[PDB]
Design a protein around this ligand. Structure first.
Ligand SMILES: Cc1cc2nc3c(=O)[nH]c(=O)nc-3n(C[C@H](O)[C@H](O)[C@H](O)COP(=O)(O)OP(=O)(O)OC[C@H]3O[C@@H](n4cnc5c(N)ncnc54)[C@H](O)[C@@H]3O)c2cc1C
Ligand SMILES: [Cl-]
Ligand code: NA
Length: 529
């Protein structure tokens, strides 16, 4: 009708496209993308994907690492589960056309060159120079566009899932499609399907500073909540420790792989401060390094700290970090000759919508894979290159559960249209924009790197003003990007803060002055609607 398919996939990064392909030979699939098909975090991925390929590494080692980096509450089934499947999934990417950097030289013959990053104990991250993401996204996209059973709809923003029991369909609660703002034609179209998969990315953008593209507004999570899904661990948001501090680096990350290959992290004065913090140094886990840099900033009153791989051969550097070199040069910084100014910024959402081994949420017919989800793999803190990994494995497992269910699926029934609201107000629309800035700022201050109970109350409080506020002035506003993004950020901020308030302890990326100590028995934080 308006739109019908077998499986609807909201999001076209690693998670969704790779899910797409797996399901394509036998299913009719629509992939949505809020902006052009390639703008998502996946495209901007640098460092690489973790797997275990060397005879010297082991799965066991990869598990342990993760369990460690995750500060004690990862879920082992998930981590193992997942640690035991990449390569395969990674291989599957390769079989799809992905070129990861070829070595030339174990001491006899040809291999995949591998890096490492913090918390890893052997060598295991397949990459493409320092721009893996490009290689990955570009390929997946290319195959998805050449596939008869996959339909990609760019610039199409989902607004909400259609849940049977909300539109007087009879039966148990089950998703049967979603309403989508068609950006180019400014209407909300109705889209039917037998299975919907959220693969929307993360929510880092609720914070004033981040590495992410402007899409990461967490719409997927908000949508799920609104539809009844439990969510978890949203207090565990990772601030990548090395983002660029330059007025013209709109938002810019210098991969951990730099440190993985020798880069140093320096104080504005030349000294290396990690040692004062963690014997693991430059390569300790991010919640820790990021806390350290935040500390030394506060302490010395410094705008920043520095990342330097100078002590290294200019030739290594430029072959391993082509993209970063070219881009720092254009701002007049030579990764080859000087320390680069860095600050911590919001990067990844370790929590999200709870989902089991196949990506199944709490709500029938609804899945969630990728960053938008919470599986248990990352516990309180993600280990570098486990994030792209998660997308693949769950794309996998989600394809296998789906293929089995599809055949016994209810028929594609007809659905109520969206009640296009239509009121306009040039001035009020400007305010929508003030609120965005307002949210992002206090989130940074009240639910940031160092936290306190009271600061959290301040966040909650402003969050509720914004919601009460939003309902009253906005409920009737003609939909538009700015507005949809705001409603969703706000929704998510709320869950981030409620989760942060529940954790009476400091663990992994949640650090509160009011509970410095580890509880003896802990777990995820879970909220259910
Ligand atoms: C700069 C950078 C470098 C990184 N490098 C690495 C790395 O080397 N290794 C690694 O493992 N991880 C890396 N990460 C983390 C990893 O990139 C992400 O966790 C992962 O790419 C998330 O992918 P995803 O498929 O879940 O969503 P994304 O790739 O971010 O895509 C989300 C998709 O959902 C669509 N969408 C969102 N909302 C809506 C909506 N409302 N309606 C319709 N469509 C919607 C978006 O438009 C987009 O298409 C990096 C992240 C960044 C930002
Ligand atoms: Cl990185
Ligand atoms: Na997640």
């Amino acid at each position: 009708p308006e739109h019908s398919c077998d499986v609807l996939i909201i999001g076209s990064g690693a998670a969704g496209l790779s899910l797409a392909l797996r399901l394509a030979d036998q299913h009719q699939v629509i992939v949505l993308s809020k902006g052009p098909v390639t703008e998502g975090s996946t495209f901007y991925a640098q460092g690489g994907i973790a797997a275990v390929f060397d005879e010297t590494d082991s799965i066991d080692s990869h598990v342990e690492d993760t369990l460690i980096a995750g500060a004690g509450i990862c879920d082992r089934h998930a981590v193992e589960f997942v640690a035991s499947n990449a390569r395969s999934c990674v291989q599957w990417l390769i079989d799809q056309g992905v070129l990861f950097d070829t070595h030339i030289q174990p001491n006899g013959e040809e291999s995949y060159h591998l890096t490492r990053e913090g918390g890893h104990s052997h060598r295991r991250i397949l990459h493409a120079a320092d721009a893996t993401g490009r290689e990955v996204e570009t390929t997946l996209v290319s195959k998805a566009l050449n596939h008869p059973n996959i339909r990609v709809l760019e610039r199409t923003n989902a607004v909400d899932l259609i849940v049977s029991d909300k539109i007087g369909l009879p039966g148990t609660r089950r998703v049967v499609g979603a309403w989508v703002w068609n950006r180019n034609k400014e209407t909300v179209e109705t889209c039917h399907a037998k299975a919907v998969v959220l693969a929307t990315g993360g929510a880092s953008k609720v914070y004033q500073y981040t590495t992410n593209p402007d899409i990461s507004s967490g719409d997927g999570i908000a949508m799920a909540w609104r539809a009844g899904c439990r969510v978890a661990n949203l207090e565990f948001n990772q601030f990548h420790p090395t983002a660029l501090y330059h007025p013209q680096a709109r938002n810019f990350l210098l991969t951990e792989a730099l440190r993985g290959e020798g880069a140093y992290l320096k104080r504005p004065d030349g000294t290396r401060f990690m040692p004062d913090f963690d014997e693991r140094g430059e390569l300790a886990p991010r919640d820790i390094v990021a806390r350290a840099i935040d500390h030394e900033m506060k302490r010395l009153g410094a705008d920043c700290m520095f990342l330097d791989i100078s002590h290294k051969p200019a030739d290594f550097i430029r072959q391993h970090f082509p993209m970063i070199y070219e881009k720092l040069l254009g701002l007049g910084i030579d990764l080859t000759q000087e320390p680069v100014p860095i600050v911590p910024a919001a990067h990844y959402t370790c929590g999200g919508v709870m989902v089991d081994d196949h990506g199944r949420t709490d709500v029938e017919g609804l899945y969630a894979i990728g960053e938008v989800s919470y599986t248990g793999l990352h516990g309180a803190n993600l280990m570098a290159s486990n994030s792209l990994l998660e997308c693949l494995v769950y794309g996998w497992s989600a394809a296998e559960d789906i293929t089995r269910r599809m055949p016994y699926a209810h028929d594609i029934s007809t659905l109520p249209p969206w009640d296009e609201s239509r009121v306009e107000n040039p001035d009020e629309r400007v305010v929508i924009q003030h609120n965005w800035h307002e949210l992002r700022l206090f989130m940074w201050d009240y639910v940031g790197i160092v936290r306190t109970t009271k600061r959290l109350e301040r966040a909650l409080r402003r969050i509720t003003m914004l919601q009460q506020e939003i309902d009253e002035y906005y409920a009737h506003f003609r939909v538009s990007n700015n507005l949809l993004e705001l409603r969703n950020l706000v929704q998510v901020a709320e869950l981030i803060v409620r989760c942060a308030m529940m954790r009476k302890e400091s663990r992994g990326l949640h650090f509160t002055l009011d509970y410095p100590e580890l509880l003896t028995h802990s777990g995820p934080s879970i909220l259910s609607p």
